[PDB]
């Protein structure tokens, strides 16, 4: 690794890493907020949209982070550009790619 990188093109993947959602956050809360941008992936065995909520190790409460798998990478990227710096539930979220 170094200062200059060979893959100069930007890898827009279909899963995003969101921060600062709140201690009160659900899979379907993140899904129903991000749905306005595009279609989010969904596991049918659980019946929930593919979103992994980060829970804290010592406190056992929600950290306010989640990984949101969209069906399309342009939808994943658009959700970042749109929701980065916006309030999820009174909390200003910081949205990035899950990489």
PDB file of C-alpha atoms in Angstrom:
ATOM      1  CA  UNK A   1       0.000   0.000   0.000  1.00  0.00           C
ATOM      2  CA  UNK A   2       1.038   3.669  -0.578  1.00  0.00           C
ATOM      3  CA  UNK A   3       0.006   7.331  -1.210  1.00  0.00           C
ATOM      4  CA  UNK A   4      -0.875   6.616  -4.910  1.00  0.00           C
ATOM      5  CA  UNK A   5      -3.317   3.697  -5.669  1.00  0.00           C
ATOM      6  CA  UNK A   6      -3.573   1.537  -8.892  1.00  0.00           C
ATOM      7  CA  UNK A   7      -7.439   1.229  -8.831  1.00  0.00           C
ATOM      8  CA  UNK A   8      -7.967   4.992  -9.597  1.00  0.00           C
ATOM      9  CA  UNK A   9     -11.677   4.378 -10.448  1.00  0.00           C
ATOM     10  CA  UNK A  10     -14.078   4.673  -7.442  1.00  0.00           C
ATOM     11  CA  UNK A  11     -15.662   1.301  -6.375  1.00  0.00           C
ATOM     12  CA  UNK A  12     -19.362   2.136  -5.804  1.00  0.00           C
ATOM     13  CA  UNK A  13     -20.612  -1.054  -4.025  1.00  0.00           C
ATOM     14  CA  UNK A  14     -24.264  -1.928  -3.068  1.00  0.00           C
ATOM     15  CA  UNK A  15     -23.803  -1.879   0.803  1.00  0.00           C
ATOM     16  CA  UNK A  16     -23.365   1.350   2.875  1.00  0.00           C
ATOM     17  CA  UNK A  17     -22.060   1.979   6.464  1.00  0.00           C
ATOM     18  CA  UNK A  18     -24.267   4.547   8.344  1.00  0.00           C
ATOM     19  CA  UNK A  19     -23.301   6.136  11.769  1.00  0.00           C
ATOM     20  CA  UNK A  20     -25.296   8.056  14.480  1.00  0.00           C
ATOM     21  CA  UNK A  21     -28.803   6.503  13.971  1.00  0.00           C
ATOM     22  CA  UNK A  22     -29.577   6.453  17.744  1.00  0.00           C
ATOM     23  CA  UNK A  23     -29.915   3.949  20.664  1.00  0.00           C
ATOM     24  CA  UNK A  24     -33.518   3.521  19.352  1.00  0.00           C
ATOM     25  CA  UNK A  25     -33.072   2.123  15.784  1.00  0.00           C
ATOM     26  CA  UNK A  26     -34.579  -0.942  13.924  1.00  0.00           C
ATOM     27  CA  UNK A  27     -33.809  -2.713  10.591  1.00  0.00           C
ATOM     28  CA  UNK A  28     -37.227  -1.532   9.219  1.00  0.00           C
ATOM     29  CA  UNK A  29     -36.646   2.061  10.596  1.00  0.00           C
ATOM     30  CA  UNK A  30     -33.386   2.318   8.540  1.00  0.00           C
ATOM     31  CA  UNK A  31     -35.128   0.584   5.574  1.00  0.00           C
ATOM     32  CA  UNK A  32     -38.240   2.883   5.603  1.00  0.00           C
ATOM     33  CA  UNK A  33     -35.980   6.020   5.845  1.00  0.00           C
ATOM     34  CA  UNK A  34     -33.554   4.953   2.985  1.00  0.00           C
ATOM     35  CA  UNK A  35     -36.385   3.433   0.746  1.00  0.00           C
ATOM     36  CA  UNK A  36     -37.044   6.898  -0.921  1.00  0.00           C
ATOM     37  CA  UNK A  37     -33.712   6.606  -2.867  1.00  0.00           C
ATOM     38  CA  UNK A  38     -34.162   3.049  -4.215  1.00  0.00           C
ATOM     39  CA  UNK A  39     -34.829  -0.674  -3.637  1.00  0.00           C
ATOM     40  CA  UNK A  40     -33.047  -2.224  -0.593  1.00  0.00           C
ATOM     41  CA  UNK A  41     -32.218  -6.027  -0.630  1.00  0.00           C
ATOM     42  CA  UNK A  42     -34.389  -8.358   1.579  1.00  0.00           C
ATOM     43  CA  UNK A  43     -33.781 -11.835   3.111  1.00  0.00           C
ATOM     44  CA  UNK A  44     -37.050 -13.882   2.805  1.00  0.00           C
ATOM     45  CA  UNK A  45     -36.033 -16.559   5.429  1.00  0.00           C
ATOM     46  CA  UNK A  46     -36.226 -13.820   8.153  1.00  0.00           C
ATOM     47  CA  UNK A  47     -38.493 -11.580   6.008  1.00  0.00           C
ATOM     48  CA  UNK A  48     -36.383  -8.490   6.907  1.00  0.00           C
ATOM     49  CA  UNK A  49     -34.451  -6.038   4.580  1.00  0.00           C
ATOM     50  CA  UNK A  50     -30.664  -6.776   4.626  1.00  0.00           C
ATOM     51  CA  UNK A  51     -29.444  -4.332   7.321  1.00  0.00           C
ATOM     52  CA  UNK A  52     -26.996  -5.269  10.160  1.00  0.00           C
ATOM     53  CA  UNK A  53     -27.456  -3.104  13.318  1.00  0.00           C
ATOM     54  CA  UNK A  54     -24.198  -2.599  15.320  1.00  0.00           C
ATOM     55  CA  UNK A  55     -24.869  -3.307  19.065  1.00  0.00           C
ATOM     56  CA  UNK A  56     -22.308  -2.186  21.739  1.00  0.00           C
ATOM     57  CA  UNK A  57     -20.153  -4.847  23.495  1.00  0.00           C
ATOM     58  CA  UNK A  58     -20.014  -3.479  27.141  1.00  0.00           C
ATOM     59  CA  UNK A  59     -23.406  -1.579  27.387  1.00  0.00           C
ATOM     60  CA  UNK A  60     -25.481  -4.092  25.312  1.00  0.00           C
ATOM     61  CA  UNK A  61     -27.407  -1.129  23.726  1.00  0.00           C
ATOM     62  CA  UNK A  62     -27.499  -0.023  20.028  1.00  0.00           C
ATOM     63  CA  UNK A  63     -24.440   2.056  18.903  1.00  0.00           C
ATOM     64  CA  UNK A  64     -26.452   3.761  16.132  1.00  0.00           C
ATOM     65  CA  UNK A  65     -24.519   2.110  13.243  1.00  0.00           C
ATOM     66  CA  UNK A  66     -25.867  -0.153  10.438  1.00  0.00           C
ATOM     67  CA  UNK A  67     -24.832  -1.719   7.081  1.00  0.00           C
ATOM     68  CA  UNK A  68     -27.625  -1.269   4.435  1.00  0.00           C
ATOM     69  CA  UNK A  69     -27.465  -3.623   1.374  1.00  0.00           C
ATOM     70  CA  UNK A  70     -29.305  -1.996  -1.596  1.00  0.00           C
ATOM     71  CA  UNK A  71     -30.228  -4.044  -4.736  1.00  0.00           C
ATOM     72  CA  UNK A  72     -28.347  -1.522  -6.993  1.00  0.00           C
ATOM     73  CA  UNK A  73     -24.886   0.182  -6.346  1.00  0.00           C
ATOM     74  CA  UNK A  74     -26.212   3.599  -7.948  1.00  0.00           C
ATOM     75  CA  UNK A  75     -29.015   3.462  -5.262  1.00  0.00           C
ATOM     76  CA  UNK A  76     -26.452   2.731  -2.490  1.00  0.00           C
ATOM     77  CA  UNK A  77     -24.252   5.703  -3.631  1.00  0.00           C
ATOM     78  CA  UNK A  78     -27.290   8.053  -4.044  1.00  0.00           C
ATOM     79  CA  UNK A  79     -28.443   7.227  -0.438  1.00  0.00           C
ATOM     80  CA  UNK A  80     -24.957   8.327   0.795  1.00  0.00           C
ATOM     81  CA  UNK A  81     -24.898  11.637  -1.183  1.00  0.00           C
ATOM     82  CA  UNK A  82     -28.525  12.342  -0.024  1.00  0.00           C
ATOM     83  CA  UNK A  83     -28.602  11.206   3.692  1.00  0.00           C
ATOM     84  CA  UNK A  84     -24.975  12.171   4.687  1.00  0.00           C
ATOM     85  CA  UNK A  85     -25.406  14.974   7.311  1.00  0.00           C
ATOM     86  CA  UNK A  86     -29.255  14.466   7.596  1.00  0.00           C
ATOM     87  CA  UNK A  87     -31.331  13.680  10.775  1.00  0.00           C
ATOM     88  CA  UNK A  88     -32.542  10.007  10.995  1.00  0.00           C
ATOM     89  CA  UNK A  89     -34.490  10.480  14.289  1.00  0.00           C
ATOM     90  CA  UNK A  90     -33.245  13.850  15.621  1.00  0.00           C
ATOM     91  CA  UNK A  91     -29.669  12.432  15.171  1.00  0.00           C
ATOM     92  CA  UNK A  92     -27.372  13.758  12.271  1.00  0.00           C
ATOM     93  CA  UNK A  93     -26.203  10.511  10.504  1.00  0.00           C
ATOM     94  CA  UNK A  94     -22.780  10.058   8.801  1.00  0.00           C
ATOM     95  CA  UNK A  95     -23.204   7.779   5.734  1.00  0.00           C
ATOM     96  CA  UNK A  96     -20.271   6.023   3.926  1.00  0.00           C
ATOM     97  CA  UNK A  97     -19.645   2.850   1.795  1.00  0.00           C
ATOM     98  CA  UNK A  98     -19.217  -0.481   3.717  1.00  0.00           C
ATOM     99  CA  UNK A  99     -15.537  -1.104   2.648  1.00  0.00           C
TER     100      UNK A  99
END
